[PDB]
Symmetry: C2
Subunit: 346 residues, 2 copies
């Protein structure tokens, strides 16, 4: 695992410089395509992309798991929905499934700790039948976190070996907005009141309890903000762990990963804390309608492309942004050049 | 023309209600897909869509024209670029061409007043070889504006007869950000300093002059803000006129139109002023990096989906948003239902 972290490649500045120069010469006023240009330059610097902005196969990895904190009354969704939805993921009827199909991406469903019988068709990496209730103790042991990071990281890289060049990360786990908030609070030093949202339609009355729960989780566990694995194990979840592992894996493989919403931002904070080298590989998708989204994003110094007020999760925002990534490549490769038209701008 | 305006259909509330109910029953927490849901309901109400959110063929109409105000030193792009780029549009090497191809849309290049010889392959609807210099007089006559509105409107509707269900609007005209600013100023009652931007890399020094030019245009012409055709003819341009006509045409045909950037916002203000019935047919794409974008958007009560800092024009933002529209349809039609999974939420 230290190997893994050690071996994360730095972005290729030489390739980025060549990209920039090429973009500047395209049939348009310099810088006129804004973020589309910066995105393209960003991709060019990713080693697994072969020095140019390109997209081969696409995949969306959905990490599924149950949480002990569900028993604290922090979620209105029945616990069994996790298992139900995971199965549905296998039949392509879910939100991320529909959107991925639209983007031509494949969905990979990974069970990292669903509290139910194994589901056929689902990739099995289950740690346990749901994680520990963070309100009264840790979600899991440090070793459990590390092993899962390793396992997912590897799985991720292995996909690269098969032509995947663009990853999307998502989750499925009733009550997961709670551990996500705790993590955010810990990493950004924000008070729980500021980052705790309604999640999946939690009634406004019930909020107070959710906040109390987050505080207790923190008080009781005393997670060390400077130690991302510490935080993940104590106040995170298997799903959060898995998302972080996708991020570490893609980075090691020198490939880009599209974030999703709030849950994904939480995982990204952890990943960046664990390995700053991860950052340049992350690409935001949308601006989640969850309350603590702004803070989390500010800490990541990220500005999403899409404003859709989405809050479904599952990797749906990630899928929706894929076309944007392809757009930047198309632009890079298919537009004509100023010079060829004899167009001279000051 | 009064006929045209008379016959704009109101949205189908019955279809919208049915849409909403269907969306609410999909495999997700109600309202969790946010703007994607509202967009779908919006499309459902459009009469030319046959009571459901759907996308058949897509087209991007690019209105090209030159402006007399160019001589006022308000643009660094050589005047001939309009003619050059219009030709390039025929070869698919431009920004909108590349992005439309990515979205599977077809680009229609329309010459409404380029100051050059006719360009083969370009739809010819030229009013004149460039419009009048708004700094010292009107851009054109009222009759010229009305005829062009009529002509473009018709062309637009005629495309519907051929399977097009989604339009995109764009422009091409060196110096056009000037008349766009004047219009915005007039319609929103904003001071020129507030809505005048750098356009295509205008040097910051040169701004002052641009502002002066906008003011003079207004002082001299005295456009009537309550009369959109008045404004367009006096301080607009052939390209602006044409964009407005696309909007009126799509609305009459009961079909959706995706806006582009600043220039398009200007045209939309005019269209809404001329026929409020047009509004419900408009769909924003992105949030233009032009200075007066926020004001213009506020007046349209529109919040774009895409934050890309784009400012190229040509209908590039419109093309980029097409996939979003398709996403809302996909969601509507392809997701499974809560009931079918026995999922019950409070």
């Amino acid at each position: 695992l230290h190997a893994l972290l050690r071996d994360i490649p730095a972005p290729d500045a030489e390739a980025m410089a060549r990209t920039q120069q090429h973009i500047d010469g395209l049939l348009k006023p310099p810088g006129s395509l804004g973020r589309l240009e910066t995105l393209a330059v960003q991709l060019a610097g990713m080693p697994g992309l072969n020095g140019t902005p390109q997209v081969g196969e696409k995949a969306v990895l959905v990490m599924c798991a149950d949480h002990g904190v569900w028993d604290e009354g922090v979620a209105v969704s029945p616990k069994i929905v996790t298992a139900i939805q995971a199965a549905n993921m296998t039949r392509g009827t879910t939100g991320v499934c529909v959107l991925a199909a639209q983007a031509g991406a494949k969905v990979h469903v990974i069970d990292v700790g669903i509290d139910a019988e194994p589901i056929p068709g689902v990739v099995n990496m289950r740690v346990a039948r749901g994680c520990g209730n963070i309100a009264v103790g840790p979600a899991m042991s440090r070793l459990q976190a590390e092993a899962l990071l390793l396992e997912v990281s590897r799985y991720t890289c292995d996909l690269a070996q098969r032509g995947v060049t663009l990853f999307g990360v998502g989750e499925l786990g009733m009550a997961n907005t709670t551990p996500a908030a705790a993590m955010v609070s810990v990493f950004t030093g924000s008070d729980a009141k500021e980052v705790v949202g309604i999640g999946a339609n939690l009634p406004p009355s019930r909020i107070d309890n959710k906040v109390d729960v987050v505080r207790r989780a923190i008080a009781i566990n005393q997670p060390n903000p400077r130690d991302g694995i510490d935080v993940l194990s104590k106040v995170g979840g298997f799903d959060l762990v898995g998302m972080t592992g996708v991020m570490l894996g893609a980075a090691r493989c020198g490939l880009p990963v599209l974030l999703d919403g709030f849950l994904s931002y939480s995982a990204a904070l952890a990943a960046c804390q664990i390995a700053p080298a991860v950052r340049p590989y992350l690409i935001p998708s949308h601006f989640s309608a969850e309350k603590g989204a702004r803070i989390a994003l500010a800490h990541l110094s990220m500005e999403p492309y899409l404003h859709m007020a989405m809050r479904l999760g599952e990797g749906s925002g990630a899928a929706l942004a894929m076309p944007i990534v392809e757009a930047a490549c198309a632009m890079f490769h298919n537009m004509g050049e100023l010079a060829a038209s004899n167009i001279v701008l000051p």
